[PDB]
Homo-oligomer: A and B are copies of this chain.
């Protein structure tokens, strides 16, 4: 298979610098021109760099000329994007992409890597709060009950949430995060039959590798 994997990313401060790397497999890397494409949070795609197959020619849009530098190592089968003087504008998923035709520095991008998120922001890496959403003391009808987990106060976007180590991979919704005052709030809902509730089987598995943080809080019965 053709495969591309980006690496680097994470959080930077404005004016800072970061280097992305792309590793290529399953094709003659030195036969192909390579490109980097942004996808901004409003999902607009934006090309940011292109390099010829021998590395001798490089192309950029005026939005990033002199700030970014694309480069490649045909022996390591890898592609790099040195980013410098980074700005909040540059917050995006960055994809590594191979050109459709060999040697052709134009045309189309036939294979794209999975991407690495780059966040450029002045805020500070915080760990997530995790609050159980114990259901209202009321109807609690047991045939179904809505249960929730609230994950709050972190800042680097990619938290991950899971219910009971993935055994509850159904009835769940994981709602996209949103930015309060410089901090994200995330929440999730699970709806289950009382055949598993009230019990500690309802574990909110949540992780925030940007602060090395993991907890497994329980949505205990309210009283």
Residues of A within 8 A of B (CB): 1, 25-26
Query: In whole angstroms, how far apart are the Cα atoms of A25 and B3 in the complex?
Result: 11
A76 to chain B, nearest CB (A): 12
Query: In whole angstroms, how far apart are the Cα atoms of A170 and B179 in the complex?
Result: 43
Closest chain B residue to A165 by CB distance?
B165
Residues from chain B with Cβ under 8 Å of A1 in the complex: 25
Main secondary structure of the interface of A (DSSP, over half): loop
Residues from chain B with Cβ under 8 Å of A26 in the complex: 25-26
Residues from chain B with Cβ under 8 Å of A25 in the complex: 1, 25-26
4 of the cross-chain contacts (CB-CB < 8 Å) are A1-B25, A25-B25, A25-B26, A26-B26
Closest chain B residue to A26 by CB distance?
B25
A125 to chain B, nearest CB (A): 29
A75 to chain B, nearest CB (A): 14
Query: In whole angstroms, how far apart are the Cα atoms of A25 and B27 in the complex?
Result: 10
A4 to chain B, nearest CB (A): 15
Closest chain B residue to A28 by CB distance?
B28
Query: In whole angstroms, how far apart are the Cα atoms of A145 and B25 in the complex?
Result: 49
Query: In whole angstroms, how far apart are the Cα atoms of A26 and B25 in the complex?
Result: 7
Give 4 closest A-B pairs by Cβ, nearest first.
Answer: A25-B26, A1-B25, A26-B26, A25-B25
Query: In whole angstroms, how far apart are the Cα atoms of A25 and B25 in the complex?
Result: 9
Closest chain B residue to A3 by CB distance?
B25
A203 to chain B, nearest CB (A): 14
A39 to chain B, nearest CB (A): 29
A14 to chain B, nearest CB (A): 38
